[PDB]
């Protein structure tokens, strides 16, 4: 039995109605269960056997079955509904769930670049950090350039949870280079693409 959910992510305004779908690869009767997981919390049961609300779950949640196609509908969406929704059939979970967040005002990141410290450099390794601050939506693209050469495979990034008051995100990307490589080049730049930007923003320094 294969279980698939869609969409993988969605943004909704407070008060909206949204629908999440769970498709099962064969008829399983009504045996689909739904779980909600708020950020940093354990999952809890939301709906069981396609359409039964778990104890204490609000009536604005509705589960439905059409054959092998199961839906979770959330009416009058509230901030407490943010998190990930998972569907389950017997021992099978989908890959990935459906991440729900709130639709904030579209806002481009404020971008900052930080050179490695001389103290770190003594260790043989250099970290360059690019900060993307207080942006919405969560999707953003960071491209590192070193003397205009596109970097690939030597960065990692991390994103905050959605802010409770302004619905924005922040992102931090670290480019990791050897000291030997760091000292062979002059211009270090992070180029940022985001829906709130008409053209990419580049912050740079010269070593």
């Amino acid at each position: 039995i294969q279980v698939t959910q869609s969409p993988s992510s969605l943004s909704a305004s407070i008060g909206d109605t949204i629908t999440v779908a769970c498709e099962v690869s064969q008829d399983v009767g009504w045996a689909v269960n739904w779980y909600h997981q708020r950020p940093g919390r354990p999952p809890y049961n939301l709906i069981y056997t396609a359409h039964n609300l778990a104890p204490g779950v609000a009536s604005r949640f509705r589960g439905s079955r059409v054959g092998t196609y199961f839906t979770l509908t959330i009416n009058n969406l509230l901030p407490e509904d943010v998190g990930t929704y998972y569907c389950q059939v017997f021992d099978s979970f989908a890959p990935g769930g459906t991440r729900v967040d709130l639709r904030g005002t579209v806002a481009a990141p404020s971008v900052f670049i930080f050179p490695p410290s001389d103290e770190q450099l003594k260790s043989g390794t250099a970290s360059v950090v690019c900060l993307l601050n207080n942006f919405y939506p969560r999707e953003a693209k960071v491209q590192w350039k070193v003397d205009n050469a596109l970097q690939s495979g030597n960065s990692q990034e991390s994103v905050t949870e959605q802010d409770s008051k302004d619905s924005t995100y922040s992102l931090s990307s670290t480019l990791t280079l050897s000291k030997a490589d760091y000292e062979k080049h002059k211009v270090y730049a992070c180029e940022v693409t985001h829906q709130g930007l008409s053209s990419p923003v580049t912050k740079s320094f010269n070593r």
Binding site: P43, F114, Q120, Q156, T160
Partner: protein, 226 residues
């Protein structure tokens, strides 16, 4: 039902972990014919969630006689048992792999035929970390600066977690402490930043307070403009 779990476990690859889950006052059911509480037929399930990923079912035990069902992905290195006198289930997972790093959950199943595999109650989770790395405190480096950004780079520590405050907790507006990333070295790194008025950079002192409990490492790093 209330489910209580054992604490964080840090293990080397190839080692074994025993995670405990207790369901106080929930194993038994009142039976009028016996005029007493007797062991029920509930299932205790074990699941996990790796960082950033979805849920994975590992197995269950039926508490009546200890019958079990296991995921075939773990056959040969998993045992689930229950002790009815302490109302506890044990997950024993052997030959641990780095990708067994996850939060492990026990979950309660009333085992009602009309509601298959309903996991109606969940434990808080147990962090299980599997790595070749040894406990190591972080190195803390400055991220030096209308609005300016500054921060601290908390690099090369093991295991999680690290906490960060600013100015001993007196500075909270504009602070973002990011999720750690697991580097290819097997060591973690995270950054914490704060945005402040540019006009304050030469007059107000900014200190990131880094705490790494597993190594008893505390660092108060002054972040000055370069």
């Amino acid at each position: 039902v209330r489910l209580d779990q054992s604490g964080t476990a840090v293990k080397k690859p190839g080692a074994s972990v025993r995670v405990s889950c207790r369901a106080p006052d929930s194993f038994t059911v009142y039976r009028p014919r016996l005029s007493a509480y007797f062991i029920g037929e509930f299932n205790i399930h074990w699941l996990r969630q790796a960082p950033g990923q979805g849920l994975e079912w590992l197995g269950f035990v039926n508490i009546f006689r200890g019958a079990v069902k296991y995921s075939s992905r773990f056959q040969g290195r998993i045992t689930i048992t229950r002790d009815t006198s302490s109302e506890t289930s044990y997950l024993d997972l052997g030959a641990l792999k780095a990708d067994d790093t996850a939060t492990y959950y026990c979950a309660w199943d009333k085992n009602v035929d009309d509601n298959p595999w309903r996991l109606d109650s969940w434990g808080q989770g147990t962090l299980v970390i599997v790595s070749s790395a040894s406990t190591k405190g972080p190195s803390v480096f400055p991220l030096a600066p209308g609005t300016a950004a500054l921060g601290c780079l908390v690099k090369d520590y093991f295991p999680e977690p690290v906490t960060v405050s600013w100015n001993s907790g007196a500075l909270t507006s504009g602070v973002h402490t990011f999720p750690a990333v697991l580097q290819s070295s097997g060591l973690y790194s995270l950054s914490s930043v704060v945005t402040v008025p540019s006009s304050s950079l030469g007059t107000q002192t900014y200190i990131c307070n880094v705490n790494h409990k597993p190594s008893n490492t505390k660092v108060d790093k002054r972040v000055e403009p370069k």
